[PDB]
Scaffold this active site. Structure first.
Site, mmCIF file in Angstrom:
data_model
loop_
_atom_site.group_PDB
_atom_site.id
_atom_site.type_symbol
_atom_site.label_atom_id
_atom_site.label_comp_id
_atom_site.label_asym_id
_atom_site.label_seq_id
_atom_site.Cartn_x
_atom_site.Cartn_y
_atom_site.Cartn_z
ATOM 1 N N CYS A 186 -7.257 10.125 -33.072
ATOM 2 C CA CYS A 186 -8.321 9.870 -34.037
ATOM 3 C C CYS A 186 -7.778 9.134 -35.254
ATOM 4 C CB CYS A 186 -8.956 11.190 -34.454
ATOM 5 S SG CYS A 186 -9.960 11.108 -35.937
ATOM 6 N N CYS A 230 -7.499 11.288 -38.837
ATOM 7 C CA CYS A 230 -6.534 12.351 -39.074
ATOM 8 C C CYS A 230 -5.374 12.374 -38.087
ATOM 9 C CB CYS A 230 -7.234 13.718 -39.053
ATOM 10 S SG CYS A 230 -8.068 14.094 -37.499
ATOM 11 N N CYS A 239 -13.363 13.947 -31.920
ATOM 12 C CA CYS A 239 -12.268 14.686 -32.529
ATOM 13 C C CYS A 239 -12.748 16.091 -32.857
ATOM 14 C CB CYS A 239 -11.774 13.975 -33.791
ATOM 15 S SG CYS A 239 -10.438 14.803 -34.670
ATOM 16 N N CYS A 263 -12.025 16.740 -37.254
ATOM 17 C CA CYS A 263 -12.782 16.057 -38.286
ATOM 18 C C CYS A 263 -14.039 15.440 -37.685
ATOM 19 C CB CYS A 263 -11.922 14.968 -38.945
ATOM 20 S SG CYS A 263 -11.791 13.459 -37.982
ATOM 21 N N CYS A 266 -9.554 -19.654 10.060
ATOM 22 C CA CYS A 266 -8.688 -20.608 10.739
ATOM 23 C C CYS A 266 -8.827 -20.405 12.240
ATOM 24 C CB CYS A 266 -7.230 -20.456 10.294
ATOM 25 S SG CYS A 266 -6.504 -18.852 10.680
ATOM 26 N N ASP A 319 6.001 7.023 28.927
ATOM 27 C CA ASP A 319 4.921 7.097 29.901
ATOM 28 C C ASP A 319 3.645 6.415 29.422
ATOM 29 O OD1 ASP A 319 6.414 8.477 31.833
ATOM 30 O OD2 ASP A 319 5.983 10.411 30.888
ATOM 31 N N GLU A 320 3.694 5.714 28.299
ATOM 32 C CA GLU A 320 2.557 4.990 27.756
ATOM 33 C C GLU A 320 3.014 3.581 27.408
ATOM 34 O OE1 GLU A 320 1.057 7.156 24.469
ATOM 35 O OE2 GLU A 320 2.836 6.963 23.206
ATOM 36 N N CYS A 326 0.584 -14.867 14.068
ATOM 37 C CA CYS A 326 0.089 -16.236 14.070
ATOM 38 C C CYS A 326 1.019 -17.140 13.269
ATOM 39 C CB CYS A 326 -1.326 -16.285 13.492
ATOM 40 S SG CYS A 326 -1.989 -17.948 13.232
ATOM 41 N N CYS A 334 -1.461 -18.758 9.755
ATOM 42 C CA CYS A 334 -2.054 -17.951 8.698
ATOM 43 C C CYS A 334 -1.279 -16.679 8.386
ATOM 44 C CB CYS A 334 -3.500 -17.584 9.063
ATOM 45 S SG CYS A 334 -3.660 -16.581 10.560
#
Ligand code: ZN
Ligand code: ZN
Lengths: 110, 83, 50, 49, 48, 48, 48, 49, 215
Positions: free
Chosen positions: A5, A8, A26, A29, A75, A91-92, A100, A103
């Site tokens: 403030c 004060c 404040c 005051c 683009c 296994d995956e 690119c 870009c």
DNA sequence: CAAAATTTTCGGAAGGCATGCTCTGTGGC
DNA sequence: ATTTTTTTGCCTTCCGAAAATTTTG
RNA sequence: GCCACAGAG
């Protein structure tokens, strides 16, 4: 939010009030600062530390492929640097990283 | 009724060190209480050495009663045990 | 390193002996104040142990 | 004959206070151990106790 | 002799399976090693 | 266990205090006074 | 707010990648989430 | 200073391991006749021998 | 998308494989070809057209093998079910219990996703003859019995347990104990009083057998 | 649907233990 | 009737308080 | 007798 403030040099707090509009008030005051149409923000810029591109430097001297980048509206590049990496279980399917050549905006798939 | 017969004995036929120590202590305590000995003692006076001499050629009248954990016991003659 | 003859057999020692004055201290710990033996003796009034 | 005799006399004799033997055989190296600083496989940032 | 968990004899086709491990196997292992060592010596002589 | 007469909850509340034998709380011999010092248990017993 | 955890396990203090003697890489971490590490894809759960 | 903790460690280890022994059927059992090991160390061999 | 869909599908597939292996290890009839069901066939069979996991489709029933019913004459079919709710309360748990009681199943394996309320953990012993086992999908991502630290546990029948107790001449309270809610005991589904033989591999001697009793 | 009862989880404090094993002296109350 | 501390770590049990969950209206 | 430090391995 660290503001004081001017009357004060005491700490300013934000209260709802009867009208429901926030003000910098404040508690010591009789001083207020309305913020209707005024923006206040205390930005805390967190430190940023340098990070190494863990996939950078791998798209050098590798075979290319004909895959359209997802940003087709900006683009129309077709040739992209591609390579294979195994970052999953055995296994995956072993994932493909391809970027690119016109870009950037690197992206991956399984 | 808990005695295992002599044919069906399963515990090892080798006399353990604890059996040797207990046998020597018991025989020495017996000799110290004026029991007769079964060896030709050559001036020996201490009961422990007489007990060792008795065990040396297996002339000691004791048997070992080994307790299995279930409760059945097993009697082995000291002269039968291999040392 | 001096050359010492042994006092037992009289012959020369086959290695030179490091020979000279060293300051030695006699410490206060002497075996006359440390030796102890009990057999039977006094017993505590409470626990009746030595 | 020697191998069989060495094997048959190597068995744990019944009545052995083997728990007390193990307790002492674990505690005494603890006395002999000096306190040193170790690290986990060649990297100095671990300091595994 | 190897007995299964039920308490009868075990067939020769499945003597070395996991569920038929007994307390005597260490002894058996020792004997095997013993035989192997002797066999090694014999093999050396044969090679000579 | 309530099968014995002493197996009751009210046993675990002080009603009768067993005063110990003086052979386990003996009076210490004199040091510099004709009087003899007493054990703490005897003093606490008198206070009780 | 800037002290919340958005990714990773909440108990892992840190993680390092160690190149062993034979040259293969292993991932060794400081923390108490064993199950979450061995359930994480890319990590063999039967050897952790 | 290492002896101060090592003594307590040895005391705890022994007060936990004192009761075990090798019975006459080659099974290690507690004082309450409960099995800890069916054979000592898996083969029943004395470390001393 | 990628993170919310593919990772969840892979985790559910690995949990399904672990559940199949667990049911096979209990002696129930599950063919070998069904446990290495690849991710492509799993997506083509148990997943939705748009790419969602249909956990109601992947619930199934298991029947004992002739060898298992020969060794254990009291074993009957089980029903394993995966729940769709994130956190299971008491309503869906009671529904599962009612289904198990109505279809007369000896036991039922319940697989919740995130967490189970403590009010449902006290509702599992409700059926007197049947038992209910609750598992977590996160706890089934990796199989614990294939870990190198965990040795081979093999539960013994009543005849084999009696033979062991007669061979070592002791009462069942003197055996080493294994708790229930222990991970391997939960995997094999030991009940109270069952004795499991454990094949330990020590470098000193080789392979030796120990025994534990469930408590 | 949300008010009220029941149960679980989570802290900080309150207790306790450890702080070797033996042995030899003195000095003051 | 002003007013210092004087090792350091580990462990379980208790006990409101708040959070989480179920249970009544 | 109780405390208190002092030492020995
Ligand atoms: Zn002001
Ligand atoms: Zn592009």
């Amino acid at each position: 939010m660290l503001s004081f403030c001017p009357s004060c040099n005491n700490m300013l707090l934000i209260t709802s009030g009867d009208s429901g509009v926030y003000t910098l008030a404040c508690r010591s005051c009789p001083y207020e600062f309305p913020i209707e149409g005024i923006e206040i923000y205390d930005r805390k810029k967190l430190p940023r530390k340098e990070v190494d591109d863990v996939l950078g430097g791998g798209w050098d001297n590798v075979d290319q492929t004909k895959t359209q980048c997802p940003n087709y509206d900006t683009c129309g590049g077709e040739s992209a640097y591609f390579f294979q990496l195994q970052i999953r279980s055995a296994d995956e399917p072993m994932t493909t990283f391809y970027k690119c050549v016109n870009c950037g905006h690197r992206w991956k798939e399984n | 009724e808990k005695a295992i017969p002599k044919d069906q004995r399963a515990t090892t036929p080798y006399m353990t060190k604890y059996e040797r120590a207990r046998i020597l202590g018991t025989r020495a305590l017996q000799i110290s209480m004026n029991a007769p000995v079964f060896v030709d003692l050559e001036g020996e006076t201490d009961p422990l050495r007489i007990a060792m001499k008795e065990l040396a050629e297996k002339k000691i009248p004791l048997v070992i009663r080994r307790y299995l954990p279930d409760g059945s016991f097993e009697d082995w003659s000291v002269e039968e045990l291999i040392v | 390193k001096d050359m010492l003859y042994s006092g037992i057999t009289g012959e020369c020692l086959q290695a030179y002996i490091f020979f000279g004055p060293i300051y030695y201290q006699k410490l206060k710990h002497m075996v006359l104040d440390k030796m102890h033996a009990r057999a039977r003796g006094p017993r505590a009034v409470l626990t009746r142990q030595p | 004959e020697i191998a069989l005799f060495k094997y048959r006399k190597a068995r744990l004799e019944p009545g052995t206070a083997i728990g007390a033997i193990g307790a002492q055989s674990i505690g005494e190296p603890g006395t002999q151990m000096t306190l040193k600083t170790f690290h986990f496989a060649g990297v100095a940032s671990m300091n595994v106790t | 002799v190897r007995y299964d968990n039920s308490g009868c004899l075990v067939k020769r086709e499945d003597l070395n399976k996991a569920e038929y491990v007994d307390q005597y196997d260490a002894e058996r292992d020792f004997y095997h090693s013993l035989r192997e060592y002797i066999n090694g010596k014999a093999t050396a002589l044969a090679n000579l | 266990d309530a099968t014995v007469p002493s197996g009751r909850p009210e046993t675990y509340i002080w009603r009768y205090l067993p005063a110990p034998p003086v052979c386990i709380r003996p009076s210490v011999m004199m040091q510099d006074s004709p009087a003899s010092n007493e054990d703490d248990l005897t003093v606490k017993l008198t206070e009780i | 707010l800037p002290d919340v955890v958005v990714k990773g396990l909440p108990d892992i203090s840190r993680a390092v990648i160690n190149i062993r003697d034979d040259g293969k890489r292993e991932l060794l971490v400081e923390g108490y989430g064993l199950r979450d590490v061995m359930c994480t894809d890319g990590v063999i759960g039967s050897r952790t | 200073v290492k002896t101060a903790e090592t003594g307590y460690m040895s005391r705890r280890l022994m007060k936990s391991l004192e009761d075990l022994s090798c019975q006459y059927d080659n099974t290690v059992r507690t004082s309450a006749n409960g099995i800890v090991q069916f054979t000592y160390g898996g083969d029943g061999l004395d470390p001393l021998e | 998308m990628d993170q919310e869909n593919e990772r969840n599908i892979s985790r559910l597939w690995r949990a399904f494989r672990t559940v199949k292996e667990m049911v096979k290890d209990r002696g129930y009839f599950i063919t070998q070809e069904e446990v290495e069901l690849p991710l492509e066939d799993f997506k083509a069979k148990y997943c939705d057209s748009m790419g969602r996991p249909q956990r109601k489709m992947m619930s199934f029933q298991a029947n004992p093998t002739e060898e298992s019913i020969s060794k254990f004459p009291d074993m009957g079919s089980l029903w394993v079910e995966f729940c769709d709710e994130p956190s299971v309360g008491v309503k869906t748990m009671k529904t599962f219990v009612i289904h198990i009681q109505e279809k007369n199943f000896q036991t039922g394996i319940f697989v919740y996703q995130n967490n189970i309320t403590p009010s449902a953990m006290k509702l599992v012993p409700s059926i007197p003859p049947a038992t209910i086992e609750t598992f977590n999908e996160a706890a089934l991502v990796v199989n614990i019995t294939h870990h190198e630290l965990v040795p081979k546990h093999i539960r013994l029948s009543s005849d084999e347990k009696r033979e062991l107790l007669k061979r070592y001449r002791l009462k069942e309270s003197q055996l080493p104990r294994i708790q229930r809610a222990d991970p391997v005991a939960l995997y094999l589904g030991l009940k109270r009083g069952e004795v499991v033989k454990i094949i330990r591999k020590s470098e000193t001697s080789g392979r030796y057998a120990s025994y534990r009793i469930c408590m």
